[PDB]
Curated annotation (Swiss-Prot), chains A, B:
Entry annotated with the keyword Ubl conjugation: no
Listed Gene3D superfamilies: Aspartate Aminotransferase, domain 1 (3.90.1150.10), Type I PLP-dependent aspartate aminotransferase-like (Major domain) (3.40.640.10)
One Pfam family here: Aminotran_1_2
Gene coding for it: aspC
Residues engaged in binding L-aspartate: 34, 130, 183, 374
Protein name, UniProt field: Aspartate aminotransferase
Length: 396, 396
């Protein structure tokens, strides 16, 4: 068996890594990373997390299994971050949360739940989107279709082309929205647009699936769910997949959740059971450590105070780099307007460079970036900003 | 969309615990648990585990992602544990290990790998088996078929019906073997019987899949891998799904591995990349905490020393409760020979009790058992042994 299995193709983001740690020549800049890096270039453990991990060390008495849905307090804190402090969704008891292995595991259990219990046969994702959205939905047996999103010329949300591509989508199709900090584009709808899409979605019959992986990195924790909260205001049913990988620095402990809301509680209880059946045939029940660290910090006023300040300085660093990048491009002599970098959100933006420009940048040296011209702004430091900008100007 | 989604039935194992908690009776006994419980009735955190968690607390500088296959020495260590330190499979670089969320996770990853890359279509599981076996394989789109195993009349392995049901069972069918401590019977093949099944497995063309959830709980760490090792001597190809939930008491940190062995190095690397492609569309990369704890313990000779003793104490406690159960039973008047209980391994046995006697023990007494009559011997203490045997003697 296996004698003739063909290799899997190299995961585009994930293959640049080894080319980088193989280059080993001097002042290399890797901007194809998917994680936050500080001014040192390190991805530290938040000290709010180090303080909650020692409370757990000293307080845990069992590593017995968690329920299929995970830790209760985890679920409740997630519903308050997503829908806000006193919403009807929470008080009417219309939402159920299964703690999950990361934002990806959330996507995948929604997908198995949806493939196995509904008539959904499609999901519309944006062009472009995180590459792995096509593969997780596809591995569940769903067809993924692409709506338009980006304007390659003006560097914006081509709203008129997104509405228009979306008009081909039928009722009972799921449409996938990135809740804030769009990967790879960083371009996000205004509240006025989110409300347009909300209303259009009610009347055309889409099921909304929000993927909320960077809450806190564009504007702020609540501001960032303004979009999800306008859909939630008017939808009877919707699904939200989130991740605490980026805002808690908890990448490898696999921390995310998958929230179901339905019209009332007895329906969402009946549907969450089939969601829970999906989890049990997948990994049985979730990793406790990282979700325990998330629920400890969010449950306690002192730790949550320190965490919000750690999320704030990460947000503010990215914002300082976006600004310091288009100013250094200006004074080192760039002949294109990069102002648009300042209008986009979170760690990613398309620099607007050609495939052959990113290949020459890497080979004629030093700057590594995703072949799409995607650049992670958190890989820039005041120290490497001038050699990086040096090289981008030298290839324009 | 979720309006007419139907409930999903009570999980056989899971749903009993509620019934118990919620019964609020006096001296009640729960033998429907699936975790080790000590003499006092609790599932503690191993001392060696708590020492590696302080080591990690003090030493981790980042929670940046793990590769798709997780921690390398985690993988090296489980290959030596499974196949012994000088195995040709290791020296010839014929096996690849991916770290997964638990043994359930390992089994869903093998299933998605087989279902979407291979031609498998069928996997044969013993009758009876752990009930969630059928659900992980069915969720990936594979038929599960049953082979006979257990003789109710003599309480043994009737090898003749097992060998006879694995006939025909087409070349290229998957056959799942519990490596040691068969759940639910505790009935295991002898080394002559493992060697016969190995020989008949290469004659016939089957793909063996070992579920290895309890290594160390029958007669030893190494004694318990003789079966697998007897197949691994003769096969070109083999999959192993192991869990570190029980022998390390790390139930909820989801620690398990999925090992692929193919006939040589180049084939396992081409087949393992499609395995990684299956992982990446599921949860993307594995929970780091529980597996970091298993690699710190197994790679530090001091800690490994304390752990093997902790593991040994748990094996011996279960061996004592098995003797103490048939003894107390013979003294309280027990009408039937229960000596077979001592012949079986690990934490489970079928008590040989009727669905109606199992409800008699719950409704009239405090004894909770799964309706198959499966009891977990680790839920017995020197203390409750005699109220428990008085109740089953009353229903015989
Ligand atoms: C848009 C998006 N969705 C999901 C994920 C996956 O999140 P996680 O790392 O929590 O699995 C990411 C992160 N790579 C993402 O950017
Ligand atoms: C035979 C068998 N296989 C796999 C598993 C799953 O182990 P885990 O809880 O680590 O996923 C168990 C335990 N429930 C088991 O008994």
């Amino acid at each position: 068996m296996f004698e003739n299995i063909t290799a899997a193709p190299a995961d585009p983001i994930l293959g640049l890594a080894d080319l980088f740690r193989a280059d080993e020549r001097p002042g290399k800049i890797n901007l194809g990373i998917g994680v936050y890096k500080d001014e040192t270039g390190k991805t530290p453990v938040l000290t709010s997390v180090k303080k909650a991990e020692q409370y757990l060390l000293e307080n845990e008495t069992t590593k017995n299994y968690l329920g299929i849905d995970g830790i209760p307090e985890f679920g409740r804190c997630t519903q308050e971050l997503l829908f806000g402090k006193g919403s009807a969704l929470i008080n009417d008891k219309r939402a159920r949360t299964a703690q999950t292995p990361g934002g990806t595991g959330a996507l995948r259990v929604a997908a198995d739940f949806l493939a196995k219990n509904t008539s959904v046969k499609r999901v519309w994702v944006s062009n472009p989107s995180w590459p792995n959205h096509k593969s997780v939905f596809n591995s569940a047996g769903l067809e993924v279709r692409e709506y338009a999103y980006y304007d390659a010329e003006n560097h914006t949300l081509d709203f008129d082309a997104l509405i228009n591509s979306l008009n081909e989508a039928q009722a009972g199709d799921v449409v996938l929205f990135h809740g804030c900090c769009h990967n790879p584009t960083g371009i996000d709808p205004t509240l006025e647009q989110w409300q347009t899409l909300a209303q259009l979605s009610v009347e055309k019959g889409w099921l909304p699936l929000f993927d909320f992986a960077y809450q806190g990195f564009a504007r702020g924790l609540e501001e960032d769910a303004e979009g999800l909260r306008a859909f939630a205001a008017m939808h009877k049913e919707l699904i939200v997949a989130s991740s605490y990988s980026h805002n808690f620095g908890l990448y490898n402990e696999r921390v995310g959740a998958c929230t179901l809301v339905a019209a009332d509680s007895e329906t969402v209880d009946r549907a969450f059971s089939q969601m829970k059946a999906a989890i049990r045939a997948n990994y049985s029940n979730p990793p406790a450590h990282g979700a325990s660290v998330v629920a400890t910090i969010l449950s306690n006023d002192a730790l949550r105070a320190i965490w919000e300040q750690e999320l704030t300085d990460m947000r503010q660093r990215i914002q300082r780099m976006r600004q310091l990048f288009v100013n250094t491009l200006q004074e080192k002599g760039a002949n294109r307007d990069f102002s648009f970098i300042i209008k986009q959100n979170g760690m990613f933006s398309f620099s607007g460079l050609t495939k052959e420009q990113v290949l020459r940048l890497r080979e004629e040296f030093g700057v590594y970036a995703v072949a799409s011209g995607r650049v992670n702004v958190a890989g820039m430091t005041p120290d490497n900003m001038a050699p990086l900008c040096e090289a981008i100007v030298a290839v324009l």
